[PDB]
Amino acid sequence: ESTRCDPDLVLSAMVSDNHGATYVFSGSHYWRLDTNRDGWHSWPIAHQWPQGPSTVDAAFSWEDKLYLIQDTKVYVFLTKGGYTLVNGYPKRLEKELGSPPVISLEAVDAAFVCPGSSRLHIMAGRRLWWLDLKSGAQATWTELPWPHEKVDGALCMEKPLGPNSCSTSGPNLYLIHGPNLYCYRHVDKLNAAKNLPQPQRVSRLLGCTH
Ligand SMILES: [Cl-]
Ligand code: NA
Ligand code: NA
Numbered sequence: 425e426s427t428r429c430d431p432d433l434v435l436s437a438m439v440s441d442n443h444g445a446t447y448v449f450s451g452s453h454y455w456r457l458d459t460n461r462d463g464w465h466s467w468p469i470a471h472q473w474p475q476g477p478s479t480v481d482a483a484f485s486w487e488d489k490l491y492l493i494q495d496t497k498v499y500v501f502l503t504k505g506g507y508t509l510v511n512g513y514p515k516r517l518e519k520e521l522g523s524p525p526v527i528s529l530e531a532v533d534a535a536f537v538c539p540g541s542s543r544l545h546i547m548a549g550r551r552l553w554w555l556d557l558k559s560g561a562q563a564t565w566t567e568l569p570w571p572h573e574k575v576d577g578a579l580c581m582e583k584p585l586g587p588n589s590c591s592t593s594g595p596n597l598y599l600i601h602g603p604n605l606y607c608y609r610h611v612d613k614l615n616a617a618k619n620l621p622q623p624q625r626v627s628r629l630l631g632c633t634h
Pocket of ligand 2 (some may be wrong): 482534577
């Protein structure tokens with residue numbers, strides 16, 4: 425194969441919840457990879473995020489909150505006992521996270537927060553920033569170097585995506601672009617890299633024969 429094993433499949437976001445549930449988004453649908461083996465059925469976003477966005481451009485989780493971003497709107501859900509939209513959401517992104525100095529963002533491509541950090545990393549185009557989630561809209565975005573010109577989604581977590589990790593100490597840092605899945609051992613490796621790393625294929629991750 426379905427959209428899953430399609431050569432034109434493009435993912436739009438990745439996120440994992442405080443409980444260990446990992447989701448990969450493709451526009452208006454998603455798949456759940458941390459199942460056990462509950463088919464490879466792709467669900468429409470509303471399946472679990474009843475009142476969320478139509479499509480997801482980026483996603484992250486911090487604490488017991490799961491964030492979904494659509495264009496310039498952010499949706500924040502509590503992961504108490506099922507996802508509940510937070511009162512007052514969604515909100516303009518600048519109202520929640522502030523803004524980079526010289527740019528006015530219209531869309532965001534990827535986001536991630538590594539375990540045991542309150543530092544949100546956000547990417548748009550060939551730019552990558554970090555900001556402190558503890559500072560709300562007053563956050564200062566610091567531009568970091570990296571080797572990517574464009575990404576589709578990102579994810580930082582202790583367990584590996586697929587059978588093998590690329591990090592012995594910290595959590596695995598994953599960036600996706602088109603059919604590729606890249607893994608970095610730490611954010612510093614990401615900032616220091618001059619070439620991209622051998623990618624793994626997303627299709628294989630999605631349970632395809634190739
Ligand atoms: Cl993302
Ligand atoms: Na994205
Ligand atoms: Na993400």
